[PDB]
Structure 1
Amino acid sequence: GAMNSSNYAELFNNDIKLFVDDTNVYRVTVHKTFEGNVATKAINGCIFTLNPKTGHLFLKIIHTSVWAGQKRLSQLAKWKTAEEVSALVRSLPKEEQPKQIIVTRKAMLDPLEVHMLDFPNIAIRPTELRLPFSAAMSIDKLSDVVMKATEPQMVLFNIYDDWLDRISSYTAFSRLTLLLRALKTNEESAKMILLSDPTITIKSYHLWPSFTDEQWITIESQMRDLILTEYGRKYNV
């Protein structure tokens, strides 16, 4: 069934599972035409497929060529997402295939169920959590690989860097969602928090800075302050 706060620890058990977020698959800018009508221009997107236990991120880059000459693109984007997730599952060895796929948006349920008919034992589930995975394109190295792509491409990342050497998956996912929520709420301030100290760098093979345990505590507090600050600005509290 649906995944919520009551069954949250299930994300970190030993049954392989993936979150699939489709919010950055079909990305457009809207603009005026010479005649004063409005048109869209697509930009490259991505499917965000994440194992919350291990941090493995299967970033399938969606190149704008896949939309060429197609109609009803927002509908097609859901089906293309489900096609690519299905292809990913088929590409994995049996013992790496997920037992559950959790979609962050309920509109993905039917497209994914239909593409996964050959896998009747993989449960397709919605979630009641509001997850900030749309903000994945605020992570500079992910945004860069998506924008530079000239063709469809899959790029593998560990979205937790090396954090699991020191903290549990539950804590790593909590840190990830806090960082992404902060980047979604006020991207400029969140990035300023993450880079404010030149002496802390991002390793070539990492996405986030190399903070010590104590610095992560400070950073996490600053991210919570940002989220609360923005909440007060929004609602005049």
Structure 2
Amino acid sequence: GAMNSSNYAELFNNDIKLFVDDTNVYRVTVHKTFEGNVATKAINGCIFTLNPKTGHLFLKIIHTSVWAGQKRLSQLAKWKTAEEVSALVRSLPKEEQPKQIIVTRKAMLDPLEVHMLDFPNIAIRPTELRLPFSAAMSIDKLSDVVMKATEPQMVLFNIYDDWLDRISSYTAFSRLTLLLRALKTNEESAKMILLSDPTITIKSYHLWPSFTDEQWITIESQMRDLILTEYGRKYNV
């Protein structure tokens, strides 16, 4: 059944699992036409598929060409997500295939269940957690590869950089969701925090800056402050 606050630590056991998030698959800008009607223009998207134990991110880039001539794109986007996740699973050796796939939005359950009928032993699960993975496009290097793509493409990342050399996967996921929640609540301030100090750089093969243990504690504290603030700035408290 559903993943929630009470079975949180199952994410860090030794059963392979993937989170799937489809919130950035179908993306548009809305604008006015010369006649003063409204129209959408699609921009490139991505499926966010994450192993929370290892940090491996399977970033499937959705090129706008996949929408050409199609109707009901928001419904199609859920099925295209399921089709790509199923193709990914089939591409993996049996011993790397997940035992569970956790979708971040309930609307993905039926599409994914149907595409995965060949894998009856893979559990498709929803979650009650309000995870901030929509903010993945606030990571500059992820946004950059999606926007530059000229064709469909899969790109592989470790979203934890080298953190697992020093911290556990539980702590690494807690850090990741804190950063992403901050970026979702106030992107500009969150990005200012992460990059205000020019002496701390992002390695070419990493996504985040090379903070020491002590600097991550200060960073993490600053992101909590930001989130709490915006919560007042918003609800006025």
Scaled to the shorter chain, the TM-score interval is over 0.9
Residues 171-227 of structure 1 show CA distances to partners (whole Å, capped at 9, x for unaligned) of 000000000000000000000000010000000000000000000000000000000
Find the aligned partners of 1:235 and 1:3 in 2 and give their Cα distance.
28
SS of the counterpart of 2:111?
helix
Deviation at 1:147, TM superposition (A): 0.1
In the aligned structure 2, how far is the partner of 1:182 from the partner of 1:221?
Answer: 11
**Distance in structure 2 (CA, Å) of the matches to 1:27 and 1:135:** 13
What secondary structure does 2:76 align onto? helix
Q: Deviations for 1:5-55, whole angstroms, at most 9, x for unmatched residues?
A: 100000000000000000000000101101111000000000000000000
Distance in 1 of aligned mates of 2:59 and 2:212: 27
Q: Distance in 2 between matches of 1:225 and 1:6?
A: 26
Match of 1:18, SS state, is: strand
**Structure 2 counterpart SS, 1:71:** coil
Deviation at 1:119, TM superposition (A): 0.1
Under a length normalisation based on structure 1, what TM-score does the superposition of the two structures give?
Answer: 1.00
CA separation in 2, counterparts of 1:9 and 1:59? 24
Q: Measure how far apart 1:2 and its partner are.
A: 0.3
Task: Name the SS of the counterpart of 1:35 in structure 2.
Answer: coil
Moved over 4 A (4+): none
User: How many angstroms apart in 1 are the aligned matches of 2:231 and 2:7?
Assistant: 27
User: What is the alpha-carbon distance in structure 2 between the residues aligned to residue 235 and residue 129 of structure 1?
Assistant: 21
Q: CA deviation at 1:232?
A: 0.6
Q: How many residues align?
A: 237
Quick one: distance in 2 between partners of 1:18 and 1:33? Answer: 41
Kindly provide the CA deviation profile for residues 97-153 of structure 1, in whole angstroms up to 9, marking residues without a partner as x: 000000000000000000000000000000000000000000000000000000000
Residue 81 of structure 2: aligned partner: 81
Identity of aligned residues (%): 100
1:94 shift after superposition: 0.3
Q: Matched residue of 1:9: which SS?
A: helix
Indicate the residue corresponding to 2:202 in structure 1. 202
- Where structure 1 has 5 or more consecutive residues not aligned to the other structure, the ranges are none
Compute the displacement of 1:65 (Å).
0.2
Aligned to 1:228: 228
Instruction: State the Cα RMSD in Å.
Output: 0.2
1:56 aligns with 56
Q: Give me the whole-angstrom Cα distance separating, in 2, the residues matched to 1:108 and 1:31.
A: 28
Pairwise CA distance, 1:231: 0.4
The separation in 2 between residues aligned to 1:143 and 1:132, in whole angstroms, is: 16
